[PDB]
């Protein structure tokens, strides 16, 4: 009851932190593909 | 009553995927960004 209620926030948190830990990945490989584009100046 | 056990199965699986995301963050955000800017 009470302890199950504590579970809900953690799930509501874990799904929440995944949302804004994948949100960094979209900005992450955006710069990795911008950096690998610099390899055109070498190849 | 019984539904409690599934919440940990939601905690366990959803917390193990955050491990994989963090590991893939080690390669992308820190490693290959910094390493391949140098080359």
């Amino acid at each position: 009851r009470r302890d199950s209620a504590t579970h809900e926030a953690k799930i509501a948190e874990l799904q929440a932190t995944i949302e804004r830990l994948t949100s960094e990945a979209a900005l992450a490989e955006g710069a990795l593909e911008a950096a690998r584009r610099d390899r055109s100046r070498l190849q | 009553r019984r539904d409690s056990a599934t919440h940990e199965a939601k905690i366990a699986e959803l917390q193990a995927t955050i491990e994989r995301l963090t590991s893939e963050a080690a390669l992308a955000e820190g490693a290959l960004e910094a390493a391949r800017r140098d080359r």
Partner: nanobody
Framework: DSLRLSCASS????????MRWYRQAPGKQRGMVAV???????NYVDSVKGRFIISRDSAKDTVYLQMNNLKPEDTAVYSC?????????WGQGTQVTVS
């Protein structure tokens, strides 16, 4: 040498998810260094693996960063990060320099 970096937090004994430490070598974009998780899973970027250690202490409520076998390229400004309720939070930042 070796060094210890703490990041004092405001609340949430064991309740905050991923805490990370970021460093910015001057003239370079800021990058990730270490990651800790609520349960205790940890990781490091391969540029510091086997050297930097990310740790927690739920009683004192502060994520540590043992930062050992420093190299001269480890001169950078080390700012702790976090993800609480989604919103990313940062810190004022501290600088470690070696030579």
């Amino acid at each position: 040498d070796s060094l210890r970096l703490s990041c004092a937090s405001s609340r949430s004994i064991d309740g905050i998810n991923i805490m990370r430490w970021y460093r910015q070598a001057p003239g370079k974009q800021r990058g990730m260094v270490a990651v800790v998780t609520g349960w205790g899973s940890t990781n490091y970027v391969d540029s510091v693996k086997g050297r930097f250690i990310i740790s927690r202490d739920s009683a004192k409520d502060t994520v540590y960063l043992q930062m050992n076998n420093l190299k001269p390229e480890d001169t950078a400004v080390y700012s702790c990060n976090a993800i609480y309720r989604g919103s990313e939070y940062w810190g004022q930042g501290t600088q470690v320099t070696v030579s």
